[PDB]
Amino acid sequence: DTRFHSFSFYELKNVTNNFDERPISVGGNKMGEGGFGVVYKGYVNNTTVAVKKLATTEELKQQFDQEIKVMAKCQHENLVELLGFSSDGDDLCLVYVYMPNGSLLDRLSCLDGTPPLSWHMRCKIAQGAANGINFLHENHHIHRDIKSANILLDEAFTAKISDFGLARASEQTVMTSRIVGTTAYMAPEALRGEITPKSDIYSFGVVLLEIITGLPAVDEHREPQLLLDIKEEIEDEEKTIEDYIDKKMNDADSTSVEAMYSVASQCLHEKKNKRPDIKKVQQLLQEMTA
Numbered sequence: 414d415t416r417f418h419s420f421s422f423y424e425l426k427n428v429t430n431n432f433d434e435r436p437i438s439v440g441g442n443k444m445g446e447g448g449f450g451v452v453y454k455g456y457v458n459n460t461t462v463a464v465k466k467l468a469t470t471e472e473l474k475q476q477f478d479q480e481i482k483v484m485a486k487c488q489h490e491n492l493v494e495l496l497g498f499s500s501d502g503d504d505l506c507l508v509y510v511y512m513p514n515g516s517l518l519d520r521l522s523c524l525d526g527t528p529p530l531s532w533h534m535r536c537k538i539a540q541g542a543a544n545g546i547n548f549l550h551e552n553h554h555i556h557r558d559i560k561s562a563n564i565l566l567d568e569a570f571t572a573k574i575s576d577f578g579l580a581r582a583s584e585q586t587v588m589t590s591r592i593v594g595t596t597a598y599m600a601p602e603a604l605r606g607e608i609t610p611k612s613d614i615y616s617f618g619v620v621l622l623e624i625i626t627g628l629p630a631v632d633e634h635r636e637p638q639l640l641l642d643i644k645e646e647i648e649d650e651e652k653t654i655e656d657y658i659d660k661k662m663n664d665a666d667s668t669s670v671e672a673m674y675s676v677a678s679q680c681l682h683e684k685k686n687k688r689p690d691i692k693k694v695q696q697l698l699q700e701m702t703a
């Protein structure tokens with residue numbers, strides 16, 4: 414129930430300086446890649462924008478149409494806002510409201526010298542991302558790729574879920590022959606082909622451990638290589654959550670950290686049916702602050 418502006422490919426190509434692959438530091442427009450396309454910076458109709466140039470040529474178009482369909486239905490403060498698209502020119506384009514603070518992944522890794530996020534900001538981001546996932550679930554949508562690189566941050570560090578190309582509708586448990594997502598964030602059933610909102614909750618649990626630790630979901634040069642495994646180290650009493658807390662924080666209290674960890678631990682239950690639903694995750698995150 415939302416109609417979008419149709420942008421000219423050449424208006425987008427013009428404003429993004431002919432889709433420059435160079436970073437913003439040197440003089441280019443490229444903001445990043447991974448979402449089956451490349452994101453560029455632009456200025457259109459008196460507003461700063463993000464332009465996603467998509468990007469089988471038919472499978473990429475499916476990822477383009479589904480994103481428009483999901484964004485036409487799903488409008489929430491904790492979701493990215495689509496302004497319009499482009500189909501006329503060579504490549505397919507998606508135009509969104511610009512997210513000045515980029516991704517949660519980049520802000521947890523302090524990429525390009527940006528200051529570390531305070532525990533106060535992290536609690537707000539976790540609550541915001543949970544409100545975004547709740548909105549999608551209440552509206553019978555499964556994201557299928559909940560990860561820190563897909564949680565974007567605005568002018569006020571408000572969390573905004575992005576990338577709905579792989580999203581699926583509900584309004585059970587479906588199965589698929591095309592297993593999509595990011596392995597390090599994926600639930601056991603999702604890696605096996607199942608399609609359930611319960612898998613989105615698991616992925617969110619990995620995101621909460623990233624928020625607490627400031628560690629990426631997967632690191633080749635690390636023990637354990639997968640962040641989700643720390644849950645076992647803490648459960649076996651070999652280590653504690655306090656040993657994993659991001660040292661790049663001066664405002665993190667033990668009570669709220671443990672309260673967030675408890676939510677992440679519950680989210681990361683290997684049995685899909687034992688996991689809390691998004692409404693419970695939302696409640697618990699609110700109770701943590703309050």
Ligand SMILES: O=c1[nH]c(NC2CC2)nc(N[C@@H]2C[C@H](CO)[C@@H](O)[C@H]2O)c1-c1nc2ccccc2s1
Pocket residue numbers: 444445446447448452462463465493509510511512513514515516519562563565575576
């Ligand atoms: O509006 C944006 N601003 C910034 N950067 C500001 C200068 C800081 N980066 C974005 N994406 C990149 C995605 C990537 C992780 O893979 C990171 O490297 C991010 O930088 C977007 C959007 N990306 C998307 C993607 C889908 C929907 C909406 C948007 S808006």
